[PDB]
């Protein structure tokens, strides 16, 4: 009697004039309101109210039908239900003894569908049961707040694709007009439809769980290590304020996460290696010791098809064949001939927006292949010189065109952005310029297409054309856009020198380490370098805190060495990571400044300052170079934002707190070491004490050169202070 009982119920209701009035005068639309009509209020103090009600005999509201399904009194004479109707419904008031009764003695259903419906939940336990624990380590680490994924096993659908799918799976006949384009949608539907046939769990719970499962959800969390969802899921277990619990969840990685981590590892290794005396030797060492989730980096590099500049430098070193390309918009980009160079510049979008953006300037040629489409591209500086394109469908040729127009960096696409497009997230975090544009013009190219123009095509027919419509067109096309139809995938043997320059067998320069992106990303999966060349605690913030913590804890030895044998101190290997945080162009001068200042402190007895030494020491670690520049600070690149470390006194980055007697680096204690004359702030000058108008007006720093041995001044030294300086009668060579 499928349909029998419900139509009979309906009959009875329509026999009541009131109910008939409601059902004949309430639109489906208006049902959305009257569905919520109530005198009942959302409890405002549920904790108190439950403590109150749980003292009562009949605090629970149950379906009327409970009266048919369980006894009125149990074996012990407890009343389980009553006939009192709960306010505003036909539910009845029952005892908590009714719940226990049901659970010991009620009807037994089969639970076969439970694992599948609540898979998202059960998978959590599966990962944990098959998880492996390593040691706990104790240290301070900066946990930086970022947005991370929180639900492993999603299918990367938008809420409207999920809805569409869930409508098909759970309520197919109520779908309405339109149906599913995507094939992802279709194979999920079938799988789920097949998994959940004959399912008797409430469709509400099935839809709820499907929605939780299928849609990617994120959250902003403080997170020090691996950002993958399977690690996020156990953040409470693996990360504490002063500890890491090494752990590997059961199950496979995502190929996406591994690829992403491989790139981060390879970039980290390249950047660390470039600052060693023998980059190639250092890079090979790190390649050979590093693992990603206990998989050797060497094996990943042999088996993994990722084409990226740092990855390829590592592959070359290891004698692995490379496809001299990178990824962009899902398409693989082999550079045939020419080259260019990375330069940042300001750029007004048609959105009406200023934006620093790395722009490649120069002549280049690109073979481009995807899984459905391919093309030949010729490029200048923000110049789409020409794009010859092919594939399976019109669709797939289009989708690559969009990508290439955007890839050009042309003004016409720059100034075709319309509506909401920003380059910083809500949290003020800078986003990828190019990926933003790509996602935009894939949502809607109509402006882009109309803003581009057209071109009259010749009779060398075979060189076809595509119109601002998206239309196939014989005599006209867009600008630089044509249509046509061995060894693009083919991996080549290269050679690599001591400084990581990669060349073919013919000996042409394919890759230089300066072409490796400077972006410090966060790895989706754990990286263990297992290397003497890398701090045990990963990450840029940790380079800072680790280095200073290490100086301090070893200060007694390092001090004696500062006094007796500086040059050996400066060249120590523990300072190399820190060097990677300093802008390349500043390393030598920063070093020269620091060594000079340190020599001055030696020459001018009685002016020892251990904090000043600790603070500047890592900047000593580069072949020096003397100059005229006085520095008021040194720049450090942390996560692509410059922090400035003030030469004189405390800064946000580095400060000594008198009250705690600790040095605080990026907000973290790194422990403590435990006259007015300052010898190690200015090159060639001494600070005596507070300013004195006796010796004339307050000079900037960059106006002190025009003094002479013994001659004094007043200086705006920094952070609002004015001080009395003296140019030294003898200076220090270093």
């Amino acid at each position: 009697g499928s349909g029998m009982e419900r139509i009979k119920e309906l009959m009875e209701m329509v026999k009541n004039s009131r109910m008939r009035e409601i059902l004949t005068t309430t639109s489906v639309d208006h049902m959305a309101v009257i569905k919520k009509y109530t005198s009942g209020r959302q409890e405002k103090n549920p904790a108190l109210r439950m403590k109150w009600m749980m003292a009562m005999k009949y605090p629970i509201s149950a379906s009327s039908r409970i009266r048919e399904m369980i006894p009125e009194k149990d074996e012990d004479g407890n009343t389980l239900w009553t006939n009192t109707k709960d306010a505003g419904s036909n539910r009845v008031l029952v005892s908590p003894n009714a719940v226990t009764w049901w659970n010991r003695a009620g009807p037994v259903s089969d639970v076969v569908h439970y694992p599948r419906v609540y898979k998202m939940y059960f998978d959590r336990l599966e990962r944990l049961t098959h998880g492996t624990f390593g040691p706990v380590k104790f240290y301070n680490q900066v946990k930086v707040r970022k947005r991370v994924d929180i639900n492993p096993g999603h299918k990367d659908l938008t809420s409207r694709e999920a809805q569409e799918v869930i409508m098909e799976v759970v309520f197919p006949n109520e779908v309405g007009a339109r149906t599913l384009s995507s094939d992802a949608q279709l194979t999920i539907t079938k799988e789920k439809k097949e998994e959940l046939k004959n399912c008797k769990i409430s469709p509400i719970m099935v839809a709820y769980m499907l929605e939780r499962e299928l849609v990617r959800r994120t959250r902003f969390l403080p997170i020090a290590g691996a950002t993958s969802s399977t690690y996020v899921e156990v953040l409470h277990l693996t990360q504490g304020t002063c500890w890491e619990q090494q752990y590997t969840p059961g199950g496979e990685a995502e190929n996406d996460d591994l690829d992403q981590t491989l790139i981060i590892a390879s970039r980290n290794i390249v950047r660390r290696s470039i600052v060693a005396i023998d980059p190639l030797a250092s890079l090979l060492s790190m390649c050979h010791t590093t693992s990603i989730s206990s998989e050797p980096l060497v094996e990943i590099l042999r088996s993994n098809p990722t084409d990226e500049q740092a990855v390829n430098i590592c592959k070359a070193a290891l004698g692995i064949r490379i496809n001299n390309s990178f990824s962009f918009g899902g398409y693989n980009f082999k550079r045939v001939k020419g080259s260019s160079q990375r330069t940042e510049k300001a750029v007004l979008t048609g959105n009406l927006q200023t934006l620093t953006m790395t722009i490649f300037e120069g002549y280049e040629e690109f073979n481009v292949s995807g899984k459905r489409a391919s093309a030949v591209l010729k490029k200048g500086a923000q110049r789409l010189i020409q794009a010859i394109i092919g594939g399976r469908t019109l669709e797939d040729i289009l989708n690559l065109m969009i990508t290439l127009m955007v890839f050009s960096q042309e003004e016409k696409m720059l100034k075709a952005v319309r509506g909401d497009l920003n380059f910083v997230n809500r949290a003020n975090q800078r986003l990828n310029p190019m990926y933003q544009l790509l996602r935009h013009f894939q949502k809607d190219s109509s402006t882009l297409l109309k803003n581009w123009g057209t071109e009259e095509i010749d009779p060398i027919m075979g060189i076809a054309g595509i119109m601002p419509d998206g239309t196939i067109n014989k005599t006209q096309t867009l600008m630089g856009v044509r249509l046509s139809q061995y060894s693009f995938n083919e991996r080549i043997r290269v050679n690599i020198d001591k400084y990581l320059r990669v060349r073919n067998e013919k000996g042409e320069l394919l890759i230089s380490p300066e072409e490796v992106s400077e972006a410090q990303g966060q790895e989706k999966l754990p990286i263990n370098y297992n290397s003497s060349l890398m701090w045990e605690v990963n990450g840029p913030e940790s380079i800072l805190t680790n280095t200073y913590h290490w100086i301090i804890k070893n200060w007694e030895l390092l001090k004696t060495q500062w006094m007796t044998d500086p040059t050996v101190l400066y060249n120590r290997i523990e300072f190399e990571p820190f060097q990677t945080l300093i802008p390349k162009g500043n390393r030598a001068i920063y070093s020269g400044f620091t060594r000079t200042l340190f020599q001055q402190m030696r020459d001018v007895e009685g002016t020892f300052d251990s904090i000043q030494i600790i603070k500047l020491l890592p900047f000593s670690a580069h072949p020096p170079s003397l100059g005229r520049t006085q520095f008021s600070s040194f720049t450090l690149n942390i996560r692509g934002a410059p922090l400035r470390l003030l030469i004189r006194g405390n800064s946000q980055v580095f400060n000594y707190n008198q009250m705690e007697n600790v040095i605080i680096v990026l907000g973290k204690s790194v422990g403590s070491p435990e006259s007015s004359i300052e010898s190690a702030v200015l090159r060639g000058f001494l600070i005596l004490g507070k300013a004195n108008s006796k010796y004339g007006p307050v000079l900037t720093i960059g106006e002190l050169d025009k003094l002479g041995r013994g001659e004094k001044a007043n200086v705006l030294i920094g952070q609002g202070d004015t001080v009395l300086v003296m140019k030294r009668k003898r200076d220090s060579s270093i």
Partner: protein
């Protein structure tokens, strides 16, 4: 120190301190100056070209798409048909029902904006009829009564 007027529709005494005399001490002041506010908002427009336009565009789309039942999402709501607070959904239903009995029903479209139209149009009514429970009695609000209730915020203390 602002300007008093009597409202033509409600008879309410209404104080207007805007463009009033400038503050003369540090006591809390409501003497906000229109031209200064406008300068600030213009400044915000200039710092963020296209921001106002985009936020407006999104708001327009929202106005077109929003269903009347969006208003069910509030908590305790002043219910003018009863002169008592009610859950938001119950308050919405009551307004809709009394509106339709008095001839306002653009909201039958299911669109919030049509309910908003009904609201403004309801103020033209000579006498809005509601029913009180003594059994059941029809009560006619004066145009002024009704408008006062429409413009009411109920008050209670924060616990």
């Amino acid at each position: 120190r602002g300007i008093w007027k009597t409202n033509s529709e409600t008879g309410a005494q209404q104080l207007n301190p805007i463009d009033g005399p400038l503050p003369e001490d540090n006591e809390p002041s409501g003497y906000a100056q229109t031209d200064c506010v406008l300068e600030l908002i213009e400044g915000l427009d200039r710092s963020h070209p296209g921001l106002f336009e985009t936020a407006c565009q999104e708001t327009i789309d929202a106005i077109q798409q929003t269903r009347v039942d969006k208003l069910t999402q509030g908590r305790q709501t002043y219910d003018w048909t009863l002169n008592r607070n009610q859950p938001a959904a119950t308050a919405l239903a009551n307004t809709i029902e009394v509106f339709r009995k008095n001839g306002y029903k653009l909201n039958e479209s299911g669109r919030l904006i049509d309910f908003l139209k009904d609201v403004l149009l309801s103020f033209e009514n000579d006498s809005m009829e509601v029913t009180t429970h003594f059994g059941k009695k029809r009560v006619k609000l004066t145009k002024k009564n009704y408008l006062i209730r429409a413009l009411t915020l109920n008050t209670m203390t924060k616990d």
